Amino acid sequence: LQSTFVFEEIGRRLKDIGPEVVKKVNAVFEWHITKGGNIGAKWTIDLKSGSGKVYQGPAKGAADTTIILSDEDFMEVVLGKLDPQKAFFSGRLKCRGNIMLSQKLQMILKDYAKL
């Protein structure tokens, strides 16, 4: 899965900027990455305590938001070739739980990308 490279890099960036992202976001994000409709991976991005964590599988607890899309679409969002808002409104990006926590996440990771 191309998206794996991406979650690992997030995990690595948290080892530095973890605490400031936790304070801004305070929430747990679960991901379901598909290949051909079959889920190929589940990742959790915890941003609730400490530096945050990135691990594989579902949330140890309740996820505040569960995001579902294909590996390939995940990559287009990361690479800026696809607006995640447009993807959501076209139905290629599914989003369960606290929907406005995901734009809260988006904005804040966008910020630390410009470093």
- C-alpha closest to that of 71 among 105, 13, 31: 31
Method of elucidation = X-ray
Whether residue 85 is annotated as binding a ligand: the answer is: yes
In the chain, domain spans: 1-115
Alpha carbons 43 and 31: distance in angstroms, whole number: 5
Q: What amino acid occupies position 105? A: L
Alpha carbons 54 and 44: distance in angstroms, whole number: 6
| CB neighbour list of residue 16: distance below 8 Å, 6 or more residues apart | none
Task: Report residue 115 as tokens.
Answer: 């470093």
